[model samples]
Target: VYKVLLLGAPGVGKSALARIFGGVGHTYDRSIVVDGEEASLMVYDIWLPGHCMAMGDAYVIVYSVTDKGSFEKASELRVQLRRARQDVPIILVGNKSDLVRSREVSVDEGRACAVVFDCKFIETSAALHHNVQALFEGVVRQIRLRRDSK
Candidate 1:
């Protein structure tokens, strides 16, 4: 069981990603309410196979948009994850690329956020499915490398 956590503000698509990976056959798309407004929050927890065993060496941390406030939330989540599992593989995701018109966050900022959290960064768009699987693959690849090093 690859433990994973998706963290972001109300509208960043964390919940959508979770439903996609949930594999529970439910409608993976939904909206959340935030500050009296409907915002999208997609989150999921899943288990994927690892090289050594089913869940021996796999984990993920999917975050969203490194914009000012949202980025701060990501940092909090990062600290929480480290406290729980210091060495687990994590992937920092900057979601909502589709919102280019309102791109408050930039790739550089996202990269910096990932660096501070000690993880790789990638931008994803749940609407276009942009880099979605890539994020998962990256996490798995990291897991494999850690296992091999051990």
Candidate 2:
């Protein structure tokens, strides 16, 4: 089992993705297929920073593509996670890619931010279900990779 925390500013679709990934009416354990293996994931919606950082296997920092401020908040959360636990894998996510017309954050900018933080980057739309599986799968893969490395 992997404990994954979704962190971001309010209204950035973290809850939406968590629901989709966790399945309808499911709040805690979400079964997902990773690398052809069945895995169980525990998803949490986090609004406050606390000692739970040490308990997480991976962190998904989500931001809205249409909101630049949300992106900045994601960056700040990344820094906090790094300070809290440097070894855990972090995935930087830009949500609401379906709202491309209103996008305030560019793909290049998101990629650059990921590069700076040495984390994986993925853009997703929880409403449209775009790249949602990939996002979670990528995080699982990162967690596995980091564990293997250690």
Candidate 3:
């Protein structure tokens, strides 16, 4: 079983993704196929949720490109996420990307975050429903990749 964690500051579309988690508590079943591999993961928590390093297999650290503080917290949390398990897989997600509006942070800055910390970077275009599933699956894939080697 996989232990996946959804973490971030508020207003980063974390609530939008947590909509499905209403019926359940924290842990739930998710059947997904990342690559040719098929597995059912036990997803735990979505309420703006973390345990620093022992949280889960992969860290889906989300932040809004519109909110600079949330973005800052992502990097700040990454420091502790790396404290114990330096090799832990983290997905730095940039929510609310300004396709045509105010742009507090850019995609290039997202790249800089990844460059400084070695975590993969991502952006949740517009919709959270389908897009979240894909973003998290990509994060889990990184965990699998890190597991296979690191």
Candidate 4:
């Protein structure tokens, strides 16, 4: 089994992805404080299956929008994941790529973030189902290869 965390600011669709992958129907949302007002920040924890022949597991840390704030939070979350499991296989996901007009996060920025974390990075938009399945599958494939190599 793969233990993953869907992390991002409120309304990033973290919860929706979690429910979709987890095979459970549920809405996840949270409220955040912005400009002295409360806003919603949604996140979720999901467990997924590794590739058929893989040992151990692979986990994902999903980020939405790629805004500085969200990326900052993702960095902190990455640290926490590292502490929990040194060398844990992680994929840095930048979601909501379809909203380019409001996009603050760039592919280059996401790549840089991945380099800093020493992990793989990809921009995914669950709204369009863009790379959604492939993203998770890639993680599993990587894990399986890593396991086989060992």
Worst ten-residue run, lDDT, model 4? Answer: 47-56
> What lDDT tens digits, residue by residue, belong to model 2 across residues 1-150?
888888888999988998888776224677788989888888877653766566688888999999999999988887788788858888999999999799999999999999999999999999899999898888789988988998
All candidates: CA RMSD in angstroms?
11.0, 1.8, 3.1, 12.2
Q: How close to the true structure is residue 56 of candidate 3, measured as C-alpha lDDT?
A: 79
Sort by lDDT, top down from the best: 2, 3, 4, 1
TM-score of 3: 0.81
Taking the tens digit of each residue's C-alpha lDDT, what string does model 4 give over 35-101?
Answer: 4544332323432222311222555666777466777778877776665554446778888898888
Which candidate's lDDT is highest? 2
TM per prediction: 0.69, 0.93, 0.81, 0.70
Off by over 4 Å in 3: 18-25, 46-52, 84-86, 126-130
lDDT of 1 by residue, 1-150 (tens): 233445455666766766554433122334433335443322333322222112223334444553557767777766755555545666778887887777777889888887787778888888788887666656556755676787
State the lDDT at 85 in candidate 3. 62
- Please list the residue runs of candidate 2 whose C-alpha ends up more than 4 Å from where it truly belongs after superposition: 25-27
Worst lDDT window (10 residues) for model 3?
17-26
lDDT of 3 by residue, 1-150 (tens): 577666778677765554443222345667778888886666655532234357677777888888889989988878767674656677888877644376688889999998997878877754534366667678668878887895
| Ranking according to TM-score, highest score first | 2, 3, 4, 1
Decoy 1 TM-score against native: 0.69
Candidate 2's TM-score: 0.93
Which of the predicted structures, 2 or 3, would earn the higher TM-score when compared with the native?
2
